[PDB]
Scaffold this motif. Structure first.
Motif, PDB file in Angstrom:
ATOM      1  N   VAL A  44       0.990  -1.281  -0.049  1.00 34.58           N
ATOM      2  CA  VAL A  44      -0.026  -0.092  -0.109  1.00 34.58           C
ATOM      3  C   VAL A  44       0.917   1.162  -0.054  1.00 34.58           C
ATOM      4  O   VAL A  44       0.421   2.043  -0.704  1.00 34.58           O
ATOM      5  N   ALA A  75      -7.305  -1.755  -3.959  1.00 35.87           N
ATOM      6  CA  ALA A  75      -8.067  -0.766  -3.943  1.00 35.87           C
ATOM      7  C   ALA A  75      -8.528  -0.436  -2.442  1.00 35.87           C
ATOM      8  O   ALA A  75      -8.582   0.912  -2.089  1.00 35.87           O
ATOM      9  N   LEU A  76      -9.096  -1.492  -1.639  1.00 35.70           N
ATOM     10  CA  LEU A  76      -9.806  -0.791  -0.458  1.00 35.70           C
ATOM     11  C   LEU A  76      -8.867  -0.401   0.577  1.00 35.70           C
ATOM     12  O   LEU A  76      -9.052   0.550   1.349  1.00 35.70           O
ATOM     13  N   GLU A  77      -7.426  -0.905   0.834  1.00 36.01           N
ATOM     14  CA  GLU A  77      -6.450  -0.522   1.643  1.00 36.01           C
ATOM     15  C   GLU A  77      -6.158   0.935   1.082  1.00 36.01           C
ATOM     16  O   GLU A  77      -5.636   1.550   2.060  1.00 36.01           O
ATOM     17  N   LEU A  78      -5.856   1.032  -0.240  1.00 39.87           N
ATOM     18  CA  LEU A  78      -5.219   2.236  -0.770  1.00 39.87           C
ATOM     19  C   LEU A  78      -6.385   3.432  -0.272  1.00 39.87           C
ATOM     20  O   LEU A  78      -6.060   4.472   0.087  1.00 39.87           O
ATOM     21  N   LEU A  79      -7.855   3.230  -0.492  1.00 43.82           N
ATOM     22  CA  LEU A  79      -8.778   4.029  -0.103  1.00 43.82           C
ATOM     23  C   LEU A  79      -8.570   4.435   1.441  1.00 43.82           C
ATOM     24  O   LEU A  79      -8.503   5.675   1.795  1.00 43.82           O
TER      25      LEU A  79
END
Lengths: 87, 120, 104, 149
Positions: A44, A75-79
Protein backbone atom coordinates in the motif's frame (compact mmCIF):
# COMPACT_ATOMS: atom_id res chain seq x y z
CA UNK A 1 15.22 17.86 -3.89
CA UNK A 2 15.91 17.06 -0.27
CA UNK A 3 14.36 13.78 0.88
CA UNK A 4 12.15 12.16 3.55
CA UNK A 5 11.76 8.59 4.78
CA UNK A 6 8.42 6.78 5.18
CA UNK A 7 8.50 3.41 6.98
CA UNK A 8 5.62 0.96 6.35
CA UNK A 9 4.25 -1.31 9.10
CA UNK A 10 6.15 -4.34 7.70
CA UNK A 11 9.25 -2.13 7.94
CA UNK A 12 10.07 -1.09 4.35
CA UNK A 13 11.74 2.34 4.17
CA UNK A 14 10.54 4.63 1.35
CA UNK A 15 12.73 7.64 0.53
CA UNK A 16 11.05 10.30 -1.57
CA UNK A 17 11.46 13.94 -2.56
CA UNK A 18 9.99 15.92 0.37
CA UNK A 19 8.14 18.12 -2.11
CA UNK A 20 6.37 14.94 -3.30
CA UNK A 21 5.37 13.78 0.17
CA UNK A 22 3.77 17.19 0.91
CA UNK A 23 1.04 16.03 -1.49
CA UNK A 24 -0.33 14.44 1.70
CA UNK A 25 -1.95 16.96 4.03
CA UNK A 26 -1.44 14.51 6.88
CA UNK A 27 2.29 14.27 6.27
CA UNK A 28 2.45 18.06 5.69
CA UNK A 29 1.14 18.52 9.24
CA UNK A 30 3.35 15.72 10.61
CA UNK A 31 6.45 17.69 9.46
CA UNK A 32 5.93 20.43 12.10
CA UNK A 33 12.62 13.88 8.15
CA UNK A 34 11.31 10.37 8.99
CA UNK A 35 7.69 9.23 9.42
CA UNK A 36 6.41 5.82 10.62
CA UNK A 37 2.99 4.45 9.54
CA UNK A 38 2.34 1.59 11.97
CA UNK A 39 -0.89 0.62 10.17
CA UNK A 40 0.05 0.86 6.48
CA UNK A 41 1.88 -2.05 4.80
CA UNK A 42 4.38 -1.83 1.96
CA UNK A 43 2.07 -3.07 -0.84
CA UNK A 44 0.00 0.00 0.00
CA UNK A 45 2.61 2.55 1.03
CA UNK A 46 4.63 1.78 -2.11
CA UNK A 47 1.55 2.64 -4.14
CA UNK A 48 1.03 5.89 -2.24
CA UNK A 49 4.57 6.99 -3.13
CA UNK A 50 3.85 6.28 -6.79
CA UNK A 51 0.83 8.60 -6.54
CA UNK A 52 2.98 11.49 -5.31
CA UNK A 53 5.23 10.84 -8.31
CA UNK A 54 2.14 10.89 -10.55
CA UNK A 55 0.57 14.02 -9.02
CA UNK A 56 3.67 16.19 -8.89
CA UNK A 57 4.40 15.15 -12.49
CA UNK A 58 1.03 15.58 -14.12
CA UNK A 59 -0.38 18.68 -12.46
CA UNK A 60 0.22 21.46 -15.00
CA UNK A 61 0.19 18.93 -17.83
CA UNK A 62 -2.20 20.53 -20.28
CA UNK A 63 -2.69 18.06 -23.14
CA UNK A 64 -3.04 14.48 -21.84
CA UNK A 65 -2.85 12.65 -18.50
CA UNK A 66 -2.65 8.85 -18.04
CA UNK A 67 -4.78 6.90 -15.58
CA UNK A 68 -3.44 6.17 -12.11
CA UNK A 69 -4.07 2.39 -12.01
CA UNK A 70 -5.21 0.50 -8.93
CA UNK A 71 -5.38 -3.27 -8.67
CA UNK A 72 -8.51 -4.78 -7.11
CA UNK A 73 -6.49 -6.40 -4.30
CA UNK A 74 -5.20 -3.00 -3.11
CA UNK A 75 -8.12 -0.67 -3.82
CA UNK A 76 -9.73 -0.97 -0.42
CA UNK A 77 -6.58 -0.52 1.65
CA UNK A 78 -5.42 2.25 -0.67
CA UNK A 79 -8.73 3.98 -0.03
CA UNK A 80 -8.27 3.78 3.73
CA UNK A 81 -4.73 5.17 3.42
CA UNK A 82 -5.67 7.99 1.01
CA UNK A 83 -8.36 8.99 3.51
CA UNK A 84 -5.91 8.84 6.39
CA UNK A 85 -3.26 10.73 4.41
CA UNK A 86 -5.66 13.36 2.98
CA UNK A 87 -4.58 13.16 -0.66
CA UNK B 1 -39.05 30.21 -65.18
CA UNK B 2 -39.52 29.25 -61.47
CA UNK B 3 -42.14 29.80 -58.73
CA UNK B 4 -41.88 32.36 -55.93
CA UNK B 5 -43.08 30.70 -52.67
CA UNK B 6 -42.35 33.52 -50.20
CA UNK B 7 -45.15 35.30 -48.28
CA UNK B 8 -43.80 38.77 -49.19
CA UNK B 9 -43.44 37.46 -52.79
CA UNK B 10 -39.96 38.99 -53.13
CA UNK B 11 -38.63 36.06 -55.19
CA UNK B 12 -36.44 35.44 -52.15
CA UNK B 13 -36.97 31.69 -52.59
CA UNK B 14 -37.65 30.42 -56.12
CA UNK B 15 -38.62 26.76 -56.65
CA UNK B 16 -38.78 24.32 -59.57
CA UNK B 17 -39.95 20.70 -59.38
CA UNK B 18 -37.68 18.29 -61.26
CA UNK B 19 -39.00 14.94 -60.08
CA UNK B 20 -42.69 14.90 -59.08
CA UNK B 21 -43.40 13.11 -55.80
CA UNK B 22 -46.09 10.62 -54.71
CA UNK B 23 -49.03 10.95 -52.32
CA UNK B 24 -50.96 14.16 -51.62
CA UNK B 25 -49.44 14.83 -48.16
CA UNK B 26 -46.65 17.28 -47.32
CA UNK B 27 -44.50 17.81 -44.18
CA UNK B 28 -46.02 19.93 -41.45
CA UNK B 29 -44.63 22.03 -38.64
CA UNK B 30 -42.56 19.90 -36.26
CA UNK B 31 -42.44 16.79 -38.48
CA UNK B 32 -39.07 14.96 -38.56
CA UNK B 33 -37.88 15.20 -42.18
CA UNK B 34 -35.44 13.03 -44.13
CA UNK B 35 -33.69 14.29 -47.26
CA UNK B 36 -30.73 13.93 -49.56
CA UNK B 37 -29.39 17.25 -50.89
CA UNK B 38 -26.63 18.78 -53.02
CA UNK B 39 -25.96 22.45 -52.07
CA UNK B 40 -23.65 25.12 -53.54
CA UNK B 41 -23.18 28.89 -53.87
CA UNK B 42 -24.79 30.57 -56.91
CA UNK B 43 -21.55 32.08 -58.25
CA UNK B 44 -19.54 29.00 -57.32
CA UNK B 45 -18.18 25.58 -58.26
CA UNK B 46 -17.86 23.36 -55.17
CA UNK B 47 -20.94 21.68 -53.68
CA UNK B 48 -21.87 20.10 -50.33
CA UNK B 49 -23.64 16.68 -50.52
CA UNK B 50 -25.34 14.32 -48.08
CA UNK B 51 -24.37 11.51 -50.49
CA UNK B 52 -20.74 12.19 -49.58
CA UNK B 53 -21.48 12.00 -45.81
CA UNK B 54 -23.22 8.67 -46.73
CA UNK B 55 -26.14 9.50 -44.37
CA UNK B 56 -29.45 11.31 -45.20
CA UNK B 57 -29.94 14.79 -43.71
CA UNK B 58 -32.42 14.84 -40.84
CA UNK B 59 -34.02 17.92 -39.21
CA UNK B 60 -37.23 19.17 -37.60
CA UNK B 61 -39.28 21.27 -40.02
CA UNK B 62 -40.62 24.67 -39.11
CA UNK B 63 -38.63 24.86 -35.87
CA UNK B 64 -35.80 27.22 -37.03
CA UNK B 65 -33.19 24.43 -37.20
CA UNK B 66 -32.30 25.27 -40.81
CA UNK B 67 -32.21 28.46 -42.88
CA UNK B 68 -35.61 30.24 -43.33
CA UNK B 69 -35.56 29.13 -47.01
CA UNK B 70 -35.61 25.40 -46.16
CA UNK B 71 -38.46 25.61 -43.60
CA UNK B 72 -40.41 27.22 -46.49
CA UNK B 73 -39.26 25.07 -49.40
CA UNK B 74 -39.31 21.56 -47.87
CA UNK B 75 -42.81 22.18 -46.50
CA UNK B 76 -44.04 22.31 -50.14
CA UNK B 77 -42.49 18.97 -51.16
CA UNK B 78 -44.36 15.68 -51.64
CA UNK B 79 -42.69 12.36 -50.69
CA UNK B 80 -40.15 11.41 -53.35
CA UNK B 81 -40.19 14.88 -54.95
CA UNK B 82 -36.92 16.48 -56.07
CA UNK B 83 -36.75 20.27 -56.28
CA UNK B 84 -34.34 23.10 -57.01
CA UNK B 85 -34.31 26.12 -54.71
CA UNK B 86 -32.59 29.46 -55.37
CA UNK B 87 -32.25 31.59 -52.28
CA UNK B 88 -31.52 35.28 -51.65
CA UNK B 89 -29.24 36.29 -48.71
CA UNK B 90 -32.17 37.64 -46.66
CA UNK B 91 -33.60 34.09 -46.48
CA UNK B 92 -30.28 32.49 -45.43
CA UNK B 93 -27.05 33.91 -43.97
CA UNK B 94 -27.82 37.57 -44.72
CA UNK B 95 -25.18 40.29 -44.54
CA UNK B 96 -23.19 38.53 -41.79
CA UNK B 97 -22.76 35.31 -43.80
CA UNK B 98 -21.16 32.26 -42.16
CA UNK B 99 -17.40 31.88 -42.51
CA UNK B 100 -15.70 29.71 -43.43
CA UNK B 101 -17.96 28.57 -46.25
CA UNK B 102 -20.68 31.18 -46.61
CA UNK B 103 -19.64 34.67 -47.80
CA UNK B 104 -21.50 37.86 -47.04
CA UNK B 105 -24.80 38.28 -48.94
CA UNK B 106 -24.35 34.89 -50.64
CA UNK B 107 -27.03 33.55 -52.97
CA UNK B 108 -27.44 29.78 -52.46
CA UNK B 109 -28.76 27.02 -54.73
CA UNK B 110 -29.89 23.55 -53.61
CA UNK B 111 -31.25 20.32 -54.98
CA UNK B 112 -33.42 18.43 -52.48
CA UNK B 113 -34.99 14.96 -52.47
CA UNK B 114 -37.60 14.47 -49.78
CA UNK B 115 -37.13 10.89 -48.59
CA UNK B 116 -39.70 10.69 -45.79
CA UNK B 117 -41.41 12.68 -43.03
CA UNK B 118 -42.94 11.32 -39.80
CA UNK B 119 -44.91 12.74 -36.83
CA UNK B 120 -43.12 13.92 -33.63
CA UNK C 1 12.28 11.12 -22.34
CA UNK C 2 12.07 11.04 -18.52
CA UNK C 3 12.09 7.70 -16.67
CA UNK C 4 10.70 7.07 -13.22
CA UNK C 5 12.46 4.63 -10.94
CA UNK C 6 12.48 2.64 -7.77
CA UNK C 7 16.08 1.98 -6.66
CA UNK C 8 15.83 -0.99 -4.32
CA UNK C 9 18.12 -2.70 -1.83
CA UNK C 10 17.17 -4.86 1.17
CA UNK C 11 14.25 -2.96 2.77
CA UNK C 12 15.20 0.40 1.18
CA UNK C 13 13.42 1.94 -1.82
CA UNK C 14 14.27 5.31 -3.43
CA UNK C 15 11.87 7.12 -5.71
CA UNK C 16 13.53 9.26 -8.36
CA UNK C 17 13.40 10.29 -11.99
CA UNK C 18 16.15 10.75 -14.61
CA UNK C 19 16.63 11.07 -18.39
CA UNK C 20 17.00 8.03 -20.69
CA UNK C 21 20.21 9.78 -21.76
CA UNK C 22 21.54 9.93 -18.17
CA UNK C 23 24.18 7.35 -17.18
CA UNK C 24 24.34 4.63 -14.53
CA UNK C 25 27.13 6.65 -12.90
CA UNK C 26 24.78 9.70 -12.65
CA UNK C 27 22.27 7.46 -10.90
CA UNK C 28 24.85 6.11 -8.43
CA UNK C 29 25.63 9.74 -7.61
CA UNK C 30 21.98 10.25 -6.69
CA UNK C 31 22.29 7.15 -4.49
CA UNK C 32 25.54 8.52 -2.99
CA UNK C 33 23.83 11.76 -1.93
CA UNK C 34 21.03 9.90 -0.14
CA UNK C 35 22.59 6.74 1.36
CA UNK C 36 26.06 8.26 1.82
CA UNK C 37 28.11 5.60 -0.02
CA UNK C 38 30.47 6.38 -2.99
CA UNK C 39 29.81 5.09 -6.58
CA UNK C 40 32.79 2.73 -6.46
CA UNK C 41 31.04 1.01 -3.51
CA UNK C 42 27.77 0.44 -5.51
CA UNK C 43 26.50 -1.89 -8.26
CA UNK C 44 23.24 -1.31 -10.14
CA UNK C 45 21.11 -3.99 -11.80
CA UNK C 46 18.16 -4.36 -14.16
CA UNK C 47 16.66 -7.62 -12.94
CA UNK C 48 19.67 -9.93 -12.52
CA UNK C 49 21.98 -7.99 -14.88
CA UNK C 50 24.85 -5.73 -13.76
CA UNK C 51 24.98 -2.28 -15.41
CA UNK C 52 28.24 -0.61 -16.57
CA UNK C 53 28.74 2.92 -15.15
CA UNK C 54 29.06 4.43 -18.66
CA UNK C 55 25.98 2.93 -20.35
CA UNK C 56 22.87 5.12 -20.45
CA UNK C 57 19.65 4.05 -18.73
CA UNK C 58 18.54 4.15 -22.34
CA UNK C 59 21.09 1.59 -23.46
CA UNK C 60 20.43 -0.52 -20.34
CA UNK C 61 16.86 -1.12 -21.62
CA UNK C 62 14.84 1.40 -19.51
CA UNK C 63 12.23 3.36 -21.50
CA UNK C 64 9.79 6.06 -20.45
CA UNK C 65 6.98 3.84 -21.87
CA UNK C 66 8.05 1.20 -19.25
CA UNK C 67 9.07 3.46 -16.36
CA UNK C 68 6.13 5.74 -15.69
CA UNK C 69 5.46 7.88 -12.59
CA UNK C 70 2.48 5.66 -11.68
CA UNK C 71 4.34 2.42 -12.44
CA UNK C 72 8.06 3.07 -12.02
CA UNK C 73 10.73 0.63 -13.21
CA UNK C 74 12.96 -1.04 -10.66
CA UNK C 75 16.73 -0.72 -10.38
CA UNK C 76 18.54 -3.20 -8.10
CA UNK C 77 21.33 -1.81 -5.89
CA UNK C 78 24.08 -3.60 -3.92
CA UNK C 79 26.87 -2.22 -1.70
CA UNK C 80 30.49 -3.35 -1.09
CA UNK C 81 31.66 -4.24 2.44
CA UNK C 82 35.34 -4.55 3.46
CA UNK C 83 36.94 -6.54 0.57
CA UNK C 84 33.79 -8.04 -1.04
CA UNK C 85 30.42 -7.05 -2.62
CA UNK C 86 27.13 -8.38 -1.19
CA UNK C 87 24.80 -10.22 -3.55
CA UNK C 88 21.73 -8.44 -4.89
CA UNK C 89 18.91 -8.84 -2.39
CA UNK C 90 15.54 -7.06 -2.59
CA UNK C 91 13.10 -7.69 0.26
CA UNK C 92 9.62 -8.14 -1.37
CA UNK C 93 6.64 -5.96 -0.52
CA UNK C 94 3.80 -7.34 1.61
CA UNK C 95 1.21 -9.62 0.03
CA UNK C 96 -2.30 -8.08 -0.24
CA UNK C 97 -5.22 -9.67 1.66
CA UNK C 98 -7.75 -11.91 0.00
CA UNK C 99 -10.11 -9.94 -2.17
CA UNK C 100 -13.29 -9.42 -0.01
CA UNK C 101 -16.26 -11.42 -1.31
CA UNK C 102 -18.23 -8.40 -2.53
CA UNK C 103 -15.14 -7.36 -4.59
CA UNK C 104 -14.67 -10.73 -6.30
CA UNK D 1 -31.72 28.95 -15.36
CA UNK D 2 -28.26 30.46 -15.18
CA UNK D 3 -26.28 27.76 -17.06
CA UNK D 4 -27.85 27.25 -20.45
CA UNK D 5 -27.25 27.31 -24.18
CA UNK D 6 -28.16 30.52 -26.02
CA UNK D 7 -30.10 30.07 -29.24
CA UNK D 8 -27.49 31.96 -31.29
CA UNK D 9 -28.20 30.25 -34.64
CA UNK D 10 -24.53 30.97 -35.40
CA UNK D 11 -22.83 27.72 -36.51
CA UNK D 12 -19.44 26.85 -35.06
CA UNK D 13 -17.28 23.87 -36.10
CA UNK D 14 -15.84 22.04 -33.10
CA UNK D 15 -13.36 19.18 -32.88
CA UNK D 16 -14.07 16.82 -30.01
CA UNK D 17 -10.79 15.10 -29.15
CA UNK D 18 -10.90 12.40 -26.48
CA UNK D 19 -7.45 12.29 -24.92
CA UNK D 20 -8.72 10.32 -21.93
CA UNK D 21 -8.65 6.53 -21.41
CA UNK D 22 -12.41 6.60 -20.68
CA UNK D 23 -15.33 6.38 -23.05
CA UNK D 24 -16.57 9.97 -23.00
CA UNK D 25 -20.21 11.12 -22.90
CA UNK D 26 -20.59 14.68 -24.27
CA UNK D 27 -23.42 16.44 -22.53
CA UNK D 28 -25.22 19.37 -24.18
CA UNK D 29 -27.08 21.79 -21.91
CA UNK D 30 -30.15 22.89 -23.89
CA UNK D 31 -31.98 26.20 -23.92
CA UNK D 32 -33.65 25.45 -20.55
CA UNK D 33 -30.30 24.36 -19.10
CA UNK D 34 -31.42 20.72 -19.02
CA UNK D 35 -28.64 18.20 -19.92
CA UNK D 36 -28.89 16.11 -23.10
CA UNK D 37 -26.64 13.09 -23.89
CA UNK D 38 -24.83 12.97 -27.24
CA UNK D 39 -23.04 10.02 -28.99
CA UNK D 40 -20.04 8.79 -27.02
CA UNK D 41 -16.39 8.98 -27.98
CA UNK D 42 -13.98 6.01 -27.71
CA UNK D 43 -10.62 6.80 -26.03
CA UNK D 44 -8.24 8.41 -28.51
CA UNK D 45 -11.02 9.38 -30.86
CA UNK D 46 -11.35 12.68 -32.66
CA UNK D 47 -14.40 14.06 -34.49
CA UNK D 48 -15.47 17.31 -36.16
CA UNK D 49 -18.97 18.07 -34.78
CA UNK D 50 -21.65 20.66 -35.59
CA UNK D 51 -22.50 23.16 -32.85
CA UNK D 52 -23.17 26.89 -32.31
CA UNK D 53 -21.87 29.99 -30.55
CA UNK D 54 -22.81 30.14 -26.88
CA UNK D 55 -23.87 26.46 -26.66
CA UNK D 56 -22.71 25.06 -23.27
CA UNK D 57 -21.21 21.58 -22.97
CA UNK D 58 -19.55 19.36 -20.42
CA UNK D 59 -18.00 15.89 -20.76
CA UNK D 60 -18.22 12.75 -18.62
CA UNK D 61 -17.31 9.09 -18.31
CA UNK D 62 -20.11 7.42 -20.27
CA UNK D 63 -20.30 4.68 -17.61
CA UNK D 64 -19.57 6.20 -14.20
CA UNK D 65 -20.44 9.86 -14.90
CA UNK D 66 -17.10 10.79 -13.41
CA UNK D 67 -16.25 14.34 -14.43
CA UNK D 68 -13.68 15.10 -17.09
CA UNK D 69 -12.03 18.32 -18.23
CA UNK D 70 -12.11 20.15 -21.48
CA UNK D 71 -9.30 22.63 -22.19
CA UNK D 72 -8.38 22.17 -18.55
CA UNK D 73 -11.76 23.39 -17.36
CA UNK D 74 -15.24 22.01 -16.63
CA UNK D 75 -17.37 23.81 -19.26
CA UNK D 76 -16.90 24.41 -22.95
CA UNK D 77 -18.64 27.21 -24.86
CA UNK D 78 -17.72 27.84 -28.55
CA UNK D 79 -16.92 31.46 -29.37
CA UNK D 80 -16.88 32.43 -33.07
CA UNK D 81 -13.41 33.23 -34.35
CA UNK D 82 -12.90 35.37 -37.44
CA UNK D 83 -12.39 33.51 -40.73
CA UNK D 84 -14.32 30.51 -39.33
CA UNK D 85 -11.47 28.38 -37.98
CA UNK D 86 -12.56 25.25 -36.02
CA UNK D 87 -12.65 25.30 -32.20
CA UNK D 88 -10.76 22.48 -30.50
CA UNK D 89 -12.23 20.77 -27.46
CA UNK D 90 -9.42 18.88 -25.72
CA UNK D 91 -10.87 16.30 -23.33
CA UNK D 92 -8.70 14.85 -20.56
CA UNK D 93 -8.78 13.13 -17.20
CA UNK D 94 -8.21 15.41 -14.28
CA UNK D 95 -5.53 14.58 -11.79
CA UNK D 96 -7.98 13.03 -9.32
CA UNK D 97 -6.99 12.87 -5.68
CA UNK D 98 -5.90 9.41 -4.63
CA UNK D 99 -8.98 9.14 -2.44
CA UNK D 100 -11.32 9.99 -5.31
CA UNK D 101 -9.47 7.57 -7.53
CA UNK D 102 -9.80 4.76 -4.99
CA UNK D 103 -13.51 5.52 -4.71
CA UNK D 104 -13.74 5.25 -8.49
CA UNK D 105 -12.27 1.76 -8.52
CA UNK D 106 -14.15 0.30 -5.53
CA UNK D 107 -17.39 1.54 -7.16
CA UNK D 108 -16.51 -0.34 -10.35
CA UNK D 109 -15.76 -3.46 -8.28
CA UNK D 110 -18.57 -3.44 -5.69
CA UNK D 111 -22.28 -3.47 -6.40
CA UNK D 112 -23.89 -0.48 -4.57
CA UNK D 113 -26.12 -2.61 -2.33
CA UNK D 114 -22.87 -4.10 -0.98
CA UNK D 115 -21.02 -0.96 0.08
CA UNK D 116 -22.67 -1.63 3.46
CA UNK D 117 -20.91 -5.01 3.63
CA UNK D 118 -17.41 -3.46 3.28
CA UNK D 119 -15.31 -3.30 6.44
CA UNK D 120 -14.65 0.45 6.41
CA UNK D 121 -15.24 3.56 8.52
CA UNK D 122 -18.79 4.91 8.03
CA UNK D 123 -17.52 8.12 6.40
CA UNK D 124 -16.15 6.07 3.46
CA UNK D 125 -19.47 4.24 2.93
CA UNK D 126 -20.96 7.72 2.61
CA UNK D 127 -18.16 8.78 0.22
CA UNK D 128 -18.66 5.65 -1.92
CA UNK D 129 -22.42 6.35 -2.13
CA UNK D 130 -21.90 10.04 -2.99
CA UNK D 131 -21.59 9.20 -6.70
CA UNK D 132 -20.48 11.92 -9.19
CA UNK D 133 -23.59 13.80 -10.29
CA UNK D 134 -24.22 16.25 -13.21
CA UNK D 135 -26.97 18.04 -11.30
CA UNK D 136 -24.74 18.68 -8.25
CA UNK D 137 -21.94 19.88 -10.57
CA UNK D 138 -24.25 22.19 -12.54
CA UNK D 139 -25.37 23.74 -9.21
CA UNK D 140 -21.75 24.20 -8.08
CA UNK D 141 -20.81 25.85 -11.37
CA UNK D 142 -23.91 28.12 -11.30
CA UNK D 143 -22.59 29.55 -7.98
CA UNK D 144 -19.03 30.03 -9.30
CA UNK D 145 -20.29 32.19 -12.25
CA UNK D 146 -22.59 34.15 -9.91
CA UNK D 147 -19.76 34.80 -7.40
CA UNK D 148 -17.52 36.10 -10.22
CA UNK D 149 -19.61 39.33 -10.03
Amino acid sequence: MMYVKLISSDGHEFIVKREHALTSGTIKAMLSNEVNFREIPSHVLSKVCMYFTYKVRYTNSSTEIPEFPIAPEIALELLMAANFLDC
Amino acid sequence: QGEDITSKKDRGVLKIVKRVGNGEETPMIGDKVYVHYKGKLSNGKKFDSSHDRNEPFVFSLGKGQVIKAWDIGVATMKKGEIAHLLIKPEYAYGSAGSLPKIPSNATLFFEIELLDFKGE
Amino acid sequence: MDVFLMIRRHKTTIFTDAKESSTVFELKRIVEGILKRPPDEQRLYKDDQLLDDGKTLGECGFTSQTARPQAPATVGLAFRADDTFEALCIEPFSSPPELPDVMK
Amino acid sequence: PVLRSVNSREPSQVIFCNRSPRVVLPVWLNFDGEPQPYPTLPPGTGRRIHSYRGHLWLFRDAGTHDGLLVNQTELFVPSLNVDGQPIFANITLPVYTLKERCLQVVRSLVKPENYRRLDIVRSLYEDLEDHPNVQKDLERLTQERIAHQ
